[PDB]
Structure formats: C-alpha cells, structure tokens
Design a protein around this nucleic acid. Sequence first.
RNA 1: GCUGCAGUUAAAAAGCUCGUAGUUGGAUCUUGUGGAGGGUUCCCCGCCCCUUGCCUCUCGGCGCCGGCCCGAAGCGUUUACUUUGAAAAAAU
RNA 2: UUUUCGGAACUGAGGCCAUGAUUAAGAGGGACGGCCGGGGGCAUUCGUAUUGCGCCGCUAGAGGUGAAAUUCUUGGACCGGCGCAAGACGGACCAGAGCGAAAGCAUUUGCCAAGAAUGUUUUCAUUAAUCAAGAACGAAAGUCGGAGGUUCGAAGACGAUCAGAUACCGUCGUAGUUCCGACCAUAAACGAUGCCGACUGGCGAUGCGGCGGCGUUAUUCCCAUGACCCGCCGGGCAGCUUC
Lengths: 150, 135, 129, 84
Amino acid sequence: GRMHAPGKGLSQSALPYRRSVPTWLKLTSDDVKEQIYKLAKKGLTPSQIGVILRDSHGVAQVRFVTGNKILRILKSKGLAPDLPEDLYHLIKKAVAVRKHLERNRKDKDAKFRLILIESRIHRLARYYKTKRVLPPNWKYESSTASALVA
Amino acid sequence: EITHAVVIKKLNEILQARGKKGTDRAAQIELLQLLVQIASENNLGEGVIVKIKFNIIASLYDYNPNLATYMKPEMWQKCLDCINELMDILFANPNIFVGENILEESENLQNVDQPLRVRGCILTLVERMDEEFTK
Amino acid sequence: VRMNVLADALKSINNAEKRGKRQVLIRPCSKVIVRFLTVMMKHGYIGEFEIIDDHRAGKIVVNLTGRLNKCGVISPRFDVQLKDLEKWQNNLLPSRQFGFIVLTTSAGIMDHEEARRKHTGGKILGFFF
Amino acid sequence: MPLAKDLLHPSPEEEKRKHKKKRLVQSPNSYFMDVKCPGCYKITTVFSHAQTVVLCVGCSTVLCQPTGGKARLTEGCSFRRKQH
RNA sequence: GCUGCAGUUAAAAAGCUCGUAGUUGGAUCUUGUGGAGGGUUCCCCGCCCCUUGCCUCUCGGCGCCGGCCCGAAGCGUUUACUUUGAAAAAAU
RNA sequence: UUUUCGGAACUGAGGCCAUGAUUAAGAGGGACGGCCGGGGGCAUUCGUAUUGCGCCGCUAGAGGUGAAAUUCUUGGACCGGCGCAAGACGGACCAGAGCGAAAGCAUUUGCCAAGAAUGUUUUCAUUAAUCAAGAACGAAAGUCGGAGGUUCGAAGACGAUCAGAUACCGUCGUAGUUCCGACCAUAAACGAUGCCGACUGGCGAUGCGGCGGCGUUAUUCCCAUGACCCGCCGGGCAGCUUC
C-alpha cells in the first residue's frame, strides 16, 4: 500500500459508468473555459480549480463538458507553471522541516521523516526528467530547494 | 500601518475562515475592529475603509448560528451604529469607493469582478436588516 | 502489484470448485484469460461465462461444474520446439490419454494437440486436466 | 456464505449496501441538490459533500460547512438530487 | 534440491528503515459470407472499408484488338520467439 | 551566349484530414475537509513521598531476621507536631486499550514541526514491487570531558548462617544511577514466524472515521454538535468456534 508507511487503506473516488451531461446543466464548453482562466490568476492551482467548480457550480467534472483536462486547457494558453504542483508541495514541506531541524537538533524524529520526503522528491524527479518535462541537468539540493519554492 | 498591503492581505486572511467549524464567531468582528481604531491615516482614505466596513458589519451579521432567531438588542444597536457610520463615509465624499479609478488611491478591485454590486452591497445589507427587524 | 494476472485468476476457480460452488467472480479481466477459458470450455470442463463490462478493465463471472479437477499456471513462459513437447507433457499431465497443455503460437492460442497438426511451437502458458 | 449464491443480479440494497468499489459497477454515494432558500433568492446547485464554504450573494454569505463527509447545510430547505 | 528442498520449536529471516545497481511489473488498438482442402457454421482468391501495403515507372517478355493489362524493382517502424532452407571432418 | 529540362536546397500566405490526446487499475503520488493518538521537539506548571536541616512535645529503647548481631540512643534516638532545603519520581486511575519503522512513549498549560485512518462525481496518468553498494535511527552496561549526587548500589569493609561460605540474608559504602556535549552498535533487539499481491468458513467484541435509524438524555423552549441505544460500510490491536 503506502510507500513510506506500512499502512493500507481505501478512500479512492469512484466515478459513475454514465457520462452524458447529464442533461441538466449549462455553460457550453466555451463558458467553462473563461470560468477557469479567472481562477488561475488568483493562484488557484489545477486541483483546487476542479474542486471550486464541482462544489458550487453545475459541473460534474470538466472532462465531460470539455474534450480536455483542466491542465491541458491552461497549458494551451501558455499560462501553466514551469513545474507541477505535486513536486512543489513536496519541496514546500521539506524547507520548514529543515528550519525546525536547525532550531532543534534533538528532534531525531523530524530528521528521520526528512529522509523519506527527501528520497520521495528524487524518485518523482526521475519520472518527469526522463519524459522531457524537466531539463536533463536539474538536480535537487539545499540551494535549489530554497530558490525554486520562492 | 504601512500602505494598505499587509493590511489588505490580513483582510484576505481574516475573511477566509468564514464558515468552518472553528470560527470564534465574534472575535472576527473584534479583529476587524482591530484594523480600524488602529487605522488613523490619511487621504488614503477617508477612503477605502468603507468596504472593510461592509465586510465588518457583515461580521455584525454572520455571528448568528442560523436563519431563525432574533438579534440580541445590543447586537441590534451595534449593527445600527455600524450602518449609520457607513452612511457618514458615503455621503461626504463622493468618490465611489470600491471602484471608479482616480489618481489612484488606493486599491485594486477593478480586477475583481465589478466595483459595483460590491458597490450595490449597501442595499443588500439594508434589506437584510429590514428582514432582521421583521424577525 | 499483481505482476501476472492469469496466475492469480486460476487459483480462485481452483479454490472455488473444491469447496463446492458454481459461480465465481474473477478480476481484472484480461483478453488472455478469455481465449484460455474458450478452449477450456470446448472440451467441457466449464460452462458458459458472462463478461461484465466496466471501463476499468471489466470483471468476468463463470458457471462451472465438478468435471474440472485443477487448472494451474506455469510461469515464466518457456519455449517449446515440438521435441521438447513430450518431456513437458509427461511431467505435467496425469496420463497420456487425457489432459491438455495449453500454449500460444503465431497461429493463435490453442491446446497442444492442435499445435502438433499445424507444426507450430511457441510459448507455454498453463495446463489443466 | 450458503456456497451456491447468485452474483449475476444483486438485491436492490441488501447486496448494494456494500462498499462502492466492491460492487459490480462502481457507483458514487453522493448526489447534487438544487436549492433556493430565502437568505439568497437564487436557484443554486451544490454538491452534497461541499468540502468548502458555499457563499451567498444575498443578505447571508454562508450556506454550507465542510465536515468530515457530507456537508451540514443550514436553515434553508432547497432539495433535489435530481436523478443521480 | 533448474526439473525438485528447507528456515515458529529439530541447523536457520539481517534490530529496524531508507536506497542505486540487479530482477520483476495492470488494463486497452478487427469480425462475418461463394470457390477450393475437412466437418455440419469452423481452419488457398477474394468481398463490406482491408486483404499478401504501394507506386512508377523504365529498361530487357507474356498477352488482346497505335491503344491498353499484369509478374520482377524500392518495402510495410525495429527485435525476441516459432517454423523452413543453406552450411556443417572422420572414427565413436 | 540564353532560356528550357532534371536533381537539390531554403521561404511565405491559403485549401484538404471526423484535422491528431484509450481508460483512471478495489496500483501509486499529490491537493482538499473534518477529526484522532502516553508519536516527537522546546518552554512551562503541579503532587505526594524519600532524605537532610531548624524548632517544639513526651521519655527508653530503636533498626533487623527464620532466629541474631553489626549499627543507632538521655548533647534525646525511634515516636508525635510545625516550617524550610535538596535531589529523585509521575501512584491508584492504567486496560489480551492507543500511537511509533524499530528502539520506545503516561502530572498541567502553551508553542514548534510531523503522521495514520476515513470522507470526496478534485488533480497527475504508470510515476510500481523487492533490494548488492551506500545511509539514518538503535535498550541497558561501558569509555572521554563538564554539571549534579536524594535514592538505590557492582567494588570494598563488617555481622551472621555453614565442616568450609570469597555466596543467598542484615548494616555501612565507592564507581554507577541523574543532566549536558562526544563516542560505543550489541540483547531471548522473540510473534524465536521477511516484504508486496490474489483466493478460501462461522460468531461475538473493542479503538478510530463515515453513513442509516423506534427512542430516552443535555441546554435556550425548540432537528447547532454532546452523552446512552440499534444497525450498516472501511481499515487496526485481538479473541472464541470446526472433519
């Protein structure tokens, strides 16, 4: 199951077989696009974007009112970020850990957990960088972690 | 205390947890009051406190655990004082004070949607308040 | 993980038949499992079977009888060259007279008895009897 | 198990009370709802597990509340599914 | 002990976790009809869109009545696998 | 001499393509929401006992063992009362209960970062499994340098028991036990049971999340969310039952 904990668990989303509209709805493909573009200005990232549509607007999902994903729509403009938010959130966490570690050198538990989250960055990086989604010279270090999260 | 950016962002971050199970639900009003009585400068405005003033008489709403009830008359009079003050700020002045640019000073809220039904967010309040009196 | 799908499949229908059942549920439905069970149905060891459809990979449900004794998998997949054949089938079958080693060839998936008449070797998959 | 039970055609909720990814076809256990209370006279549509505060444009400015699952509504009826 | 071993107590799972090499890895991209060989549908030509994918042609044969048709020439993105040939000293 | 023909190379604007994206694994990663736990770090608070000290009261024995003795004692012990100081330690409550990778982890309150499970019609689209090299943590004892030293206590000195008694038992007592900074890498570090995945009986419980319900119960008088009752769905520590 879990990749750095021993646990096992199910909580996965389950989609219906259907996939019409379904009937009840509005905002033709085009309407949904301009509704999205406004949100990305405000710093709402693709995961947040689909949530804020699904909770309060008439969409089931933005993959059955468009022929594309949420991210590809943003990418066609050129307004997509230069690294995926997934990678960003890993790096975002580990800097605060390193701050706490400098403030407290006797928190061996934090030091331990850092080894996991550190190694999990490098594995993820080796997906993107082989697929030509990152430069083949980019590496993860303390210095590059500081600058890239800011 | 320093150019209406820290200020504005803390506005953001106070008008965020607005809903959830952890509200305190009355010391958000209090803390909106602690960006005004410690708001003692100048031009900038008298000016743009109006809108905060909305939001904050909106604190003077939302405290209330739901729509069926009726509003401790002290709460009622505090509401009034707010609204009344937010006639003051909005005769004297006329610039319209969640939009119509001037020279600048000192915004930005063209950039969200329209100056104007957030301008038209004073009629809303007052109708609401009619209704609360009715309750 | 679920490295090999077919290998996890057969153990269910093997276990189920022993206890005394006649309906099962096997997932996640590979095309390879379909053509296997087709050959196994012709000879008469199982009955007609229903493929449920999902977008994920499907699920299959089978109706079976006590005629089956055991179907096993042989993994990893070795080659046969129609002289290696006799050595394989001796070890894996209860008798010369019956039992059916299955394999895949460029002429499709079939029993060993058919492959010998087409002069086709290939990769062995499992067996049954 | 009685060790002979059918699995082709299940009972309407005595064999569809199971976990949603242990059913024959995967179904959600969630639904939408068409609302329109008074605090905000508009026909709003909202998902059952809100996950976030749904805002109002009327006198009110809150409609929901995200808890650990479904979402606690408020003093406004407005209910439907519809169909799904 | 590959075929074909064992590790709770008989000899025996690193104190525990991370981790490169190595090994291993989900699902998904085509079926019916006349003739021929074998049954009563099913396994060399073709047909629905495809059928040994194409052309382009030009030089040296086959045709039919200048004009026209079809074999050989580039090949189907690459391999493993399998099947057929070639080539394998004698003695044993 | 000049075009022409052929080959080759490079540039613009326009037609024609159904003009080009398989699904989202009862695989994994990531976001989001409400919770949960003696998980970890830092700061802070509290209790009683033990020992020592001062003061007050009464008088002869007190310690200890199977039985004794060493030892303690009219400058008075033990005992009773009152106050103060030092160091150590978190009882009963505390359970085939919980959390942690393992080693391990119980007084108050706050701060600092971390994590599991569950919920989700959110996101990514195979990003995985196990592992030579290499890396982090790793009880107690021990070593080095500082602080501290109540209590217990290897060593050691005594008293008994024994033919003998370097022991079991009693008194005293150093190192150590405690804290801070470096080392040391070992244990019956035991479920003596590798890790990941699939399939195959029944039954009653317990901890956590979610969902469904004839009702009692809290308050503000009334579906905020609390307690008790019944059932259902996940994953977790365990038990009972059998050809």
